[PDB]
Amino acid sequence: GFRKMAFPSGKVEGCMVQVTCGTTTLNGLWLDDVVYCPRHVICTSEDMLNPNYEDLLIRKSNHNFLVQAGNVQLRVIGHSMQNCVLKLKVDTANPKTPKYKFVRIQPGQTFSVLACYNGSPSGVYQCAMRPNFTIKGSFLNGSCGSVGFNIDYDCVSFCYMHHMELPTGVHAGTDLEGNFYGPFVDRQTAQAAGTDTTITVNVLAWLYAAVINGDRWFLNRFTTTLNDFNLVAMKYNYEPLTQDHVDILGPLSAQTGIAVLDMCASLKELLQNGMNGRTILGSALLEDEFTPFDVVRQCS
Amino acid sequence: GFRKMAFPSGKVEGCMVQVTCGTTTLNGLWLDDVVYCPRHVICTSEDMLNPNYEDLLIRKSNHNFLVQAGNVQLRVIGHSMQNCVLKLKVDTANPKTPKYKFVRIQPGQTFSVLACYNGSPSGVYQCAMRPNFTIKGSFLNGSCGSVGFNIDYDCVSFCYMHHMELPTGVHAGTDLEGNFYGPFVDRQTAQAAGTDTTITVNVLAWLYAAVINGDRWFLNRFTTTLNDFNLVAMKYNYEPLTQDHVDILGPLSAQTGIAVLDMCASLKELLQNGMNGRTILGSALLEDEFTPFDVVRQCS
């Protein structure tokens, strides 16, 4: 009774366009009279290993960017590069522009990805921005320019634009100002994300979700302290749990009648003992890509 | 690099309305000049255990159904009951009606759910129609009338409308002609689905997805036969694998260079030996809610 759920994608579907330079095609985001896309649309295959984007872009004029919205060509009347994104000014405001903002999301928070190819939406799924500033997505060639977002009220908060894949199979990208999350650069070389630490506060939120939904076998008669819990967290590359995290879990704690430090004692035992072939909310691993807010929103 | 992915929901978002009878509110699906909704909208709380729907509906007139599309009231000008759904004729065709059909989906196939409350979309996620004709969803009070669908071309194939929850926490509902999937009836009593068998062909498809995405530790030096594999399948409440299933897996077999019966030999060993703390595509359990088509569509 608890699922990984994406936001409804309609408001974002109406913003997706196709951008082509030469033989390179990817997706763009069309808001008001600007189309945002990854700057490596200007690269050929001989450019992708070590591109000099400033030099490559000087050779491009407005008419070298083909922007297609459905079957309709948009006229590009200006272009500029901002960090790792291009802004193509077009002669038509997108009539479907929703209320929106650009946000740079914090590690540990979640968002929905609308995967797109050739300017056409393909599917939607939820991701977390991991502590090492990667995401575990599903992206193929042609998917760059697909965006991540949250919806709050009628307002779309765009937080991610897709650019690349890492050797480990995870994904990296930018905010909508073109600044990468994490240490990555948009060149087609092997890059490291570092240790992929687990989002402790989210695992605890998901354990609360399990209790709400009737899965309680892992609850024990013990409690612990924050410092004692963190000694075990460290060994498993879990984020240190802070008092701020404990405060964020307060509402779930009161809803279930299970103190945060009692749930930490249960998590400690799960980390050290495993699940002994049992499952929690249909999973045999501890899930860390639901925030406390995600759990409350879903269970309400 | 492989995710549970729902279809983009925009085309369906535009069809969702709110239907109220008395104090009972749920969602309706507005296509052309008809609104489809679960018939238990006519029930009060004293009716839900053993409703006589024919007798309850005779007491209702067109003006007792309040249909709200956004902030706009629709005028109900006819009503009728078809199996477990009501069809409310309204005086306005939905201008956002997509190209659509109604399909009754086969067990083992997948679809996207647009979860809705008060006629407003809340989130989207993928489900399989399980062999015992239940789905593992996320639904609360107020969610009935939410629909499941596939998108093929520009055409929306509606296959599911949500009605109820079972004691085991799984979910049951109807096609858009109002006929339940499975043995269930729309009354608020404990009902059994029977043994929840695993969709063998889908597990094999997902193992092929894992190979495509670089996860190959479970491949062994053995092969097997269909009859020998099924002797082990039976013990684990797996669907018998048929030659028709083997044929459906043909394209994934050729894409990976792993014969179907070689992959069955790997699955056999996983079933008998477990995963020994290892994971496949980020899971510590064998996943059966991706069809062969889902895998091909995603990996393309």
Ligand SMILES: *[C@@H](O)[C@H](C[C@@H]1CCNC1=O)NC(=O)[C@H](CC(C)C)NC(=O)OC[C@H]1CC[C@H](CCC)CC1
């Ligand atoms: C969108 O244009 C595209 C999306 C990629 C393709 C495959 N999966 C994705 O998410 N992005 C790219 O092709 C970028 C473009 C450069 C200029 C940033 N290239 C990319 O993602 O490279 C993939 C790397 C994988 C790891 C490999 C080293 C392995 C030892 C090098 C390339």
Ligand SMILES: *[C@@H](O)[C@H](C[C@@H]1CCNC1=O)NC(=O)[C@H](CC(C)C)NC(=O)OC[C@H]1CC[C@H](CCC)CC1
């Ligand atoms: C939509 O109206 C609503 C959705 C339910 C509510 C909770 N989760 C859901 O999916 N459907 C209902 O309230 C139906 C209405 C009847 C008339 C079909 N009722 C329902 O789903 O009942 C839940 C059952 C759970 C198991 C319980 C027995 C446990 C020993 C009985 C009720």
